[PDB]
Amino acid sequence: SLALAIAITALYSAVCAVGLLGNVLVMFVIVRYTKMKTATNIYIFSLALAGALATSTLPFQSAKYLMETWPFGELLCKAVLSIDYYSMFTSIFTLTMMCVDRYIAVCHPVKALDFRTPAKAKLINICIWVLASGVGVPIMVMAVTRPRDGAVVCMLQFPSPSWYWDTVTKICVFLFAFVVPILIITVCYGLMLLRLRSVRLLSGSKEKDRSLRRITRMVLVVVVAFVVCWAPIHIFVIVWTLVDIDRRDPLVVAALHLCIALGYINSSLNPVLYAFLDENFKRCFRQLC
């Protein structure tokens, strides 16, 4: 019981620390050394910024878990929920546009000359943040603070029936944040891998086949990590919304915090991993060392 609590608090603290420091280091290396020439590095910078914004939310959640009540107030409750949803949608849309950019780069090379420019990539990223603000505003409006059973809880207030609009909201978030990006990324990467076999440099030799294996593994790790991290929290939250059972039981809450921790790991740690997968990012440290 007590060890479970301290273990979950240590997990949140470790994820917050490593994610925030990694995102700050990635943004620092991108600004100082790369200078945002490549459009892909601009996308990585936007993804790291969204990951750091998601990472910032975690200490308030850990403090609420330890205190077992919310003393921070309604306005900060609104800020926490708005930043959480805004950062999540920004990160997912940025990753989807990264995969679309790689698809357009490989499969349509003549079109890529016109399409891929730093100014257009910056415009697309600014449009992503502005459209994510449209998601962010109703979460800020709906969020309220109410006292329940002698304790204060931060939550979202839905219009009547609350369960129905809550369920519709969870299904819409599940659909647009999970199913459509997996579809776009899987189709783009599949067509990209089908295109890559024709290339003479990637075929006809053992070393070339090993290079194709490396490219295939680096491509598929993104899809595998995205599915593995996002699916349990979405499924558990939908089941939580449908079932009416009390949250007094510690084990179910602990599993819920593990799923939330996996979602924040995908939000924060995986942009750092995507940055480390880049050969140029390795090359900068290799030249420096």
């Binding site: 329940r148 979202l156 929290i233 819920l256 939330i260």
Partner: peptide
Amino acid sequence: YXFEVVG
């Protein structure tokens, strides 16, 4: 994502 269900 999931702060609203823990409370």
